[PDB]
Structure 1
Amino acid sequence: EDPSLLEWDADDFRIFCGDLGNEVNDDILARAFSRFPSFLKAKVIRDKRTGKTKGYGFVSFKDPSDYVRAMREMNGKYVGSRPIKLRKSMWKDRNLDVVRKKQKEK
C-alpha cells in the first residue's frame, strides 16, 4: 500500500491519462487542464532514484459531468510533445480486491 492515493480522493473522478512525453509534462498537464473548470490537483507519474517521468498520470476532476466533457475534448489532444490517451481510473486497492474476490466465488 502506497500512502500517496489519499490526496485526490474527494469523491472526485480521476481521469487516467497515458501517452505523456518523458522529457516534459512535469506540470504542463496541470497548466493545460486548469482552464476547465478551475484550480485542481494534477500530478505526473515520476519515479524516484532516476528522475525519469514514466509518462502516464492522473488528473482529479470535481464532477463526472465535467469529466465527460474534459475527456471528449482532450482525447488525443496535443499536450506537450505527444497526444494524450484518456481512460478511466481503477484504484484497485485492497478494500476493493477483497470485495472482488468475495464476489467471484458468489
Structure 2
Amino acid sequence: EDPSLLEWDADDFRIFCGDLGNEVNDDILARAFSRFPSFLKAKVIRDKRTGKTKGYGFVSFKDPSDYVRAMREMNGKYVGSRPIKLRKSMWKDRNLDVVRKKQKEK
C-alpha cells in the first residue's frame, strides 16, 4: 500500500512501459508523454538508494483513444537504448483484491 498512485490516477489510462534501459530513459519517458497527445504523466518506477530505474514505468494519459493509438505506435519503438514494450497497468489494490475474492466464490 505504497502512497504513490494518488498523483497520477485521475480516471486516466495507465500504460506500463517496460523492457527499457536500466541506466537510460530517466526522463525520456517524459519526452514520449509530451509527444503523446495527452501529455499528463510519465512516472518511472525506480528504487531508492539504487541509482537506476526498476524497469517498467507508469505513463498516465488522459485521452484513452490517444493512449491506445500511442501504444499501438510505440509498441516496440526504440526508446533510449532498448525497445520499450507498452502494456496495460494492473493496479490491483486492496479494494480490487476484495472484489476479486468476492467474485471468485460466486
Shift of 1:68: 1.1
1:50 Cα deviation after fit: 1.5
More deviation, 75-84/52-61: 52-61
Q: Does 1:76 align with 2:76?
A: yes
- Please, what is the CA RMSD of the aligned residues? 1.0
Structure 2: give runs of 5+ residues left out of the alignment. Answer: none
Aligned length: 106
Note if contact 2:28-2:80 (Cα within 8 Å) is conserved in structure 1: yes
What percent of counterpart residues are identical?
100
Q: TM-score, normalised by structure 2?
A: 0.94
Distance 1:102 1:39 in 2: 36
Quote the offset at 1:54 in angstroms.
1.2
Aligned counterparts of 2:77 and 2:71: Cα–Cα separation in 1: 10
CA deviation map 1:74-100 (0-9, x unaligned):
000000000011110110000100000
Contact 2:38/2:63 (CA < 8 Å) preserved in 1? no
Match of 1:13? 13
C-alpha displacement of 1:67: 1.1
TM-score w.r.t. length of structure 1: 0.94
| Structure 1 residue runs of 4 or more that deviate by more than 6 Å after TM superposition | none
**How far 1:45 sits from its partner (Å)?**
1.2
Gaps of at least 5 residues in structure 1 are none
- State whether residues 38 and 67 of structure 2, in contact with CA within 8 Å, keep that contact through their aligned partners in structure 1: no
